[PDB]
Amino acid sequence: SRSFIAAVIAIGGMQLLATMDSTVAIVALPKIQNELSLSDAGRSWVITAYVLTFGGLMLLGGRLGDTIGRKRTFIVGVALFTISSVLCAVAWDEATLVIARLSQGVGSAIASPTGLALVATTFPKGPARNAATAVFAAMTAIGSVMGLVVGGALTEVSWRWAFLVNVPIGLVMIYLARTALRETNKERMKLDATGAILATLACTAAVFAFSIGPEKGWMSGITIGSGLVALAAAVAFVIVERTAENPVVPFHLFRDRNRLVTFSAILLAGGVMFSLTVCIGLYVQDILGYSALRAGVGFIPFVIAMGIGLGVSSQLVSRFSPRVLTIGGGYLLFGAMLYGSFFMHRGVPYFPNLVMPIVVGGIGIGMAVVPLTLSAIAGVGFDQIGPVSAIALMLQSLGGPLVLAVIQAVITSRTLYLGGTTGPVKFMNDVQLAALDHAYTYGLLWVAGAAIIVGGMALFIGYTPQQVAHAQ
Amino acid sequence: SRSFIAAVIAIGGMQLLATMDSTVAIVALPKIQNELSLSDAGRSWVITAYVLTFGGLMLLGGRLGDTIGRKRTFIVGVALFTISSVLCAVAWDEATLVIARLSQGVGSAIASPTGLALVATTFPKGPARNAATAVFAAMTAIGSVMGLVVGGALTEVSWRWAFLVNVPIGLVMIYLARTALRETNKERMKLDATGAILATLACTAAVFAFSIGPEKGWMSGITIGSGLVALAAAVAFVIVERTAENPVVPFHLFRDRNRLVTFSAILLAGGVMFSLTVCIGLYVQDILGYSALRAGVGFIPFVIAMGIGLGVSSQLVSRFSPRVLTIGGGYLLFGAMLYGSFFMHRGVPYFPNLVMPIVVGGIGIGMAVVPLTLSAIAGVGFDQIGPVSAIALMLQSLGGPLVLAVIQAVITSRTLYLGGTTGPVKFMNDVQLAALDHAYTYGLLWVAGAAIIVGGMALFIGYTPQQVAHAQ
Numbered sequence: 001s002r003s004f005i006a007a008v009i010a011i012g013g014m015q016l017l018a019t020m021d022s023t024v025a026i027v028a029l030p031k032i033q034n035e036l037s038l039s040d041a042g043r044s045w046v047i048t049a050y051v052l053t054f055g056g057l058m059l060l061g062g063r064l065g066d067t068i069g070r071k072r073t074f075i076v077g078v079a080l081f082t083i084s085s086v087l088c089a090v091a092w093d094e095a096t097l098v099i100a101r102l103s104q105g106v107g108s109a110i111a112s113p114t115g116l117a118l119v120a121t122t123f124p125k126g127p128a129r130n131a132a133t134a135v136f137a138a139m140t141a142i143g144s145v146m147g148l149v150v151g152g153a154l155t156e157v158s159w160r161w162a163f164l165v166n167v168p169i170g171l172v173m174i175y176l177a178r179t180a181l182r183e184t185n186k187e188r189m190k191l192d193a194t195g196a197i198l199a200t201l202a203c204t205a206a207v208f209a210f211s212i213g214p215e216k217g218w219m220s221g222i223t224i225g226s227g228l229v230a231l232a233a234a235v236a237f238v239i240v241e242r243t244a245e246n247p248v249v250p251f252h253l254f255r256d257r258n259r260l261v262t263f264s265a266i267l268l269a270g271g272v273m274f275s276l277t278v279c280i281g282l283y284v285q286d287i288l289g290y291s292a293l294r295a296g297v298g299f300i301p302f303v304i305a306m307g308i309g310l311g312v313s314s315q316l317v318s319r320f321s322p323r324v325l326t327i328g329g330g331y332l333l334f335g336a337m338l339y340g341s342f343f344m345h346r347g348v349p350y351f352p353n354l355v356m357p358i359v360v361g362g363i364g365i366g367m368a369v370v371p372l373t374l375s376a377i378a379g380v381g382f383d384q385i386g387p388v389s390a391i392a393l394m395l396q397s398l399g400g401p402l403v404l405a406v407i408q409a410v411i412t413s414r415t416l417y418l419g420g421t422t423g424p425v426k427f428m429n430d431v432q433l434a435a436l437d438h439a440y441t442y443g444l445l446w447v448a449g450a451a452i453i454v455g456g457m458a459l460f461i462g463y464t465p466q467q468v469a470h471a472q
Numbered sequence: 473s474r475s476f477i478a479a480v481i482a483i484g485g486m487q488l489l490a491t492m493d494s495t496v497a498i499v500a501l502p503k504i505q506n507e508l509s510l511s512d513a514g515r516s517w518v519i520t521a522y523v524l525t526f527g528g529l530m531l532l533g534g535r536l537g538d539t540i541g542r543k544r545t546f547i548v549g550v551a552l553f554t555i556s557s558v559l560c561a562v563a564w565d566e567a568t569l570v571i572a573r574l575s576q577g578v579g580s581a582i583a584s585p586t587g588l589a590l591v592a593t594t595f596p597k598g599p600a601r602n603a604a605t606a607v608f609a610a611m612t613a614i615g616s617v618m619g620l621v622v623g624g625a626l627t628e629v630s631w632r633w634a635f636l637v638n639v640p641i642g643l644v645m646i647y648l649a650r651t652a653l654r655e656t657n658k659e660r661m662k663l664d665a666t667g668a669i670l671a672t673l674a675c676t677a678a679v680f681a682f683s684i685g686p687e688k689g690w691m692s693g694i695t696i697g698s699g700l701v702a703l704a705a706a707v708a709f710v711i712v713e714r715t716a717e718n719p720v721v722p723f724h725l726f727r728d729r730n731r732l733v734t735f736s737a738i739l740l741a742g743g744v745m746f747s748l749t750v751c752i753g754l755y756v757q758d759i760l761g762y763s764a765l766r767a768g769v770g771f772i773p774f775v776i777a778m779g780i781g782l783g784v785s786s787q788l789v790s791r792f793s794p795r796v797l798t799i800g801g802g803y804l805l806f807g808a809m810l811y812g813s814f815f816m817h818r819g820v821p822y823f824p825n826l827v828m829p830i831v832v833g834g835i836g837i838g839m840a841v842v843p844l845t846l847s848a849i850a851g852v853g854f855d856q857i858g859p860v861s862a863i864a865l866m867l868q869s870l871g872g873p874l875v876l877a878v879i880q881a882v883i884t885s886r887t888l889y890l891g892g893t894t895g896p897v898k899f900m901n902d903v904q905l906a907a908l909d910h911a912y913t914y915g916l917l918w919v920a921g922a923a924i925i926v927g928g929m930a931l932f933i934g935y936t937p938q939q940v941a942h943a944q
């Protein structure tokens with residue numbers, strides 16, 4: 001019973017590490033700017049450096065496990081992330097911080113796609129995989145709330161003390177990764193060098209272009225060149241991949257209708273979840289006036305509700321089709337979002353009108369996450385599990401900003417319509433703050449509509465329970 | 473004052489009597505079989521005799537009130553129902569019981585469609601009609617539950633005493649109708665004899681064919697002949713109605729999108745409700761093992777929740793359109809149905825697992841019923857309210873068995889699939905009982921899908937609160 005727990009914790013540790021690091025880096029940005037004397041461009045680049053190498057090197061990270069070994073790749077990625085976090089905590093100027101963030105991104109990109117593949121390969125299909133997927137999904141929310149709590153608590157001493165928290169935890173994971181997991185010593189494949197190079201070039205160019213667009217204006221020299229590089233690399237990669245042994249991206253797997261619908265649903269659902277997280281955090285900290293520590297403490301009921309939902313769904317997936325459970329979770333999520341949209345404003349008490357929608361939405365999200373994760377890794381085999389996991393994780397991470405940009409644009413337009421201001425929150429009055437609150441409650445409706453679209457899309461899955469959650 | 477209460481009670485009395493008698497007759501079939509020495513055909517015909525003349529003479533009864541008088545027709549129908557209920561108890565052989573059931577069905581068909589017309593033509597549009605509609609919808613469920621209770625607690629001595637409880641209630645409702653309702657003094661109309669005869673023949677032939685089909689077969693000469701006669705009579709009726717002085721069925725009134733969509737929604741909603749009632753009852757006395765009295769006592773919270781929902785909706789219909797209220801009530805009902813499907817099996821305790829879905833579904837049904845039946849009698853006038861009410865009642869009564877057949881076929885198919893058997897429940901062992909449990913909780917999902925379709929189609933009503941629930 002201890003071996004199973006050690007294995008699942010070791011496999012899911014990297015999700016916790018990455019999410020907590022991202023949340024802490026978001027929280028402690030102004031202190032970094034003040035102490036290190038960075039401009040707005042440097043402040044944005046502190047966050048951009050991580051995502052550049054995180055999104056650039058994810059397909060290569062997915063394919064690398066078949067060449068080196070999934071256990072070894074996982075351990076190497078975790079170790080690189082820990083050492084790079086130490087370098088972040090020790091950094092003394094802007095260049096060193098940027099280099100350390102790039103190294104953190106490289107380590108995360110190496111280690112993250114291997115975790116889902118390890119979930120799929122270590123545990124055979126059945127109850128064990130259901131429990132493993134439930135734990136894998138719970139660790140992400142645990143990391144998010146832990147990051148908020150730590151960032152709020154350590155806002156008085158220094159930002160350098162917040163980067164060191166990754167040093168212990170990561171070490172622990174390494175130990176578990178060296179103890180619970182076993183190596184099957186399978187025959188090693190041959191890496192696809194040209195495909196990996198083209199994929200990394202295309203992904204890095206796309207990420208850089210998307211990040212530099214709003215900052216320096218679109219079609220302003222750098223953006224057009226980066227976009228040209230991205231499209232040329234993508235077209236060359238697509239052409240080359242048609243005749244490559246051990247493809248980085250196996251396209252023939254995407255002919256099945258179920259896989260296409262499932263991956264589209266994964267993309268859009270990840271976008272919806274990211275939009276909810278960011279918008280609700282901003283609303284709580286800005287309008288309601290809660291500090292970071294107060295919000296981190298108040299978000300624990302979300303973790304408990306999500307754990308309950310995951311526990312229920314991991315047992316229900318053995319009898320009900322994934323589409324039914326997805327609709328069941330979406331029902332509660334939609335109800336919670338509507339209640340939050342229509343009964344929220346400044347001065348509202350915490351308990352009656354805040355914790356209830358959070359708990360109901362957490363239960364719904366927990367009930368809906370497990371069937372999607374089980375459908376994402378169904379019927380792939382041991383030769384394409386790596387690329388499939390990498391593609392699924394990449395789609396989930398990519399879907400977020402695209403929806404968040406639309407939601408923020410809608411919120412800004414509604415703020416300007418009602419008579420608001422585009423300045424800082426703490427330079428506003430009562431009427432402008434009321435306009436901002438109404439804009440936020442208006443954008444919640446667009447998030448709900450996106451969730452409705454997600455449910456309508458997931459209504460076409462067609463996977464039977466015997467295919468995803470039953471042992472042969 | 474007390475006049476309003478007496479009037480609404482007198483108008484809903486016929487619905488209460490019909491539903492209570494139906495439930496009591498269904499409960500006490502085995503005792504009738506044992507005492508009268510009947511075969512399976514006699515058992516089927518005891519139920520079929522009432523339905524034959526109830527569905528045969530609905531359309532004629534909807535127009536009979538114009539040429540004689542609504543109060544007089546109501547009183548005559550209730551009196552005939554009471555007399556036939558008296559004669560049912562004192563029956564010695566099969567023939568007397570069959571003719572008593574036929575006469576009772578004739579009285580019910582005369583009196584039932586006149587109640588809705590009296591609701592429409594007694595209280596002017598506004599709050600009074602909303603309250604009358606709420607009482608009219610509540611008395612149906614009240615009668616059903618009390619009939620279940622009475623049949624459970626009375627059929628342990630004699631089945632003849634079960635048919636005699638109708639008499640005091642019929643007498644008190646006759647007294648209330650005589651002393652509360654008032655004459656109209658409207659000019660008498662002319663009865664369309666040809667159309668009435670053709671409609672009666674068509675409906676009777678259709679009901680007889682649908683009843684005899686499953687017992688004999690789909691290739692029997694009698695069934696094919698009955699269906700052919702029904703189709704020919706329907707065609708002749710449609711041809712005759714083109715140039716009728718006072719048509720039994722006005723076909724021109726249905727040239728509106730609102731009315732057509734409303735009537736389709738009424739049909740499918742009646743089907744969904746009937747399927748829910750029958751399936752829930754069969755599950756309770758079959759799987760959970762409750763007696764008739766226990767189920768009747770346990771279904772009281774449904775009546776209370778439905779009353780609360782009706783009271784809320786009769787007040788809310790003056791501000792919100794019928795579409796919004798229907799969608800909200802259906803949302804609550806769908807949530808209750810999904811909760812029941814997911815977490816229900818033999819051995820669950822009553823308190824945490826039964827009352828909550830029942831209460832939520834009752835609130836949803838009560839909130840959804842009032843706008844639907846308020847929209848069915850909107851903008852017709854005095855000279856066309858009778859046939860419209862008759863058509864609404866007929867569509868509700870017709871929608872039930874259609875959906876119930878599909879649900880029962882699905883349940884039987886999955887019972888056979890999971891290793892169950894077809895036979896009396898008293899003989900099956902644990903495996904086949906679990907197969908029945910899973911089959912019922914699986915058919916609940918099909919009921920929920922039917923509700924989803926009902927809501928999607930009801931999204932196209934288009935009525936406004938001023939045309940439905942606003943006076944003047």
Ligand SMILES: CC/C=C/C/C=C\C/C=C\CCCCCCCC(=O)OC[C@H](COP(=O)(O)O)OC(=O)CCCCCCCCCCCCCCCCCC
Nearest residue numbers: 137140141144269270273274277283337340357358361376
């Ligand atoms: C998602 C689809 C992928 C499916 C997976 C598919 C394939 C495999 C691939 C990855 C598998 C591994 C990850 C699987 C879990 C990913 C989701 C996850 O667990 O995510 C957790 C996020 C971090 O992830 P992120 O959201 O950043 O993606 O953290 C939080 O939830 C912090 C706390 C938020 C607190 C507010 C939450 C309110 C919820 C209720 C709404 C209430 C609304 C009204 C309230 C008032 C409003 C006033 C305006």
Ligand SMILES: CC/C=C/C/C=C\C/C=C\CCCCCCCC(=O)OC[C@H](COP(=O)(O)O)OC(=O)CCCCCCCCCCCCCCCCCC
Nearest residue numbers: 609613616741742745749755809812816829830833845912
């Ligand atoms: C319907 C649309 C027309 C609208 C009106 C249209 C036109 C006008 C014309 C008539 C207007 C006047 C009548 C209007 C109300 C007619 C419906 C009515 O009130 O009906 C009541 C029935 C009697 O009437 P009947 O339905 O027989 O016609 O009585 C019961 O419902 C007893 C209670 C049983 C239980 C059910 C409720 C479960 C709720 C929970 C569900 C989930 C539970 C899961 C548990 C586990 C399950 C495992 C399998």
Ligand SMILES: CCCCCCCCCCCCC(=O)O[C@@H](COC(=O)CCCCCCCCCCC)COP(=O)(O)O
Nearest residue numbers: 269330331334368451454455456741802803806923924927
């Ligand atoms: C008398 C009887 C009257 C009856 C009247 C009935 C009237 C109609 C009643 C309401 C009908 C039931 C209902 O609300 O169904 C929707 C419920 O799911 C949704 O909202 C979808 C939500 C999807 C969310 C997907 C993502 C979730 C997780 C995201 C993070 C991972 C689904 O609808 P659809 O999308 O069209 O399939």
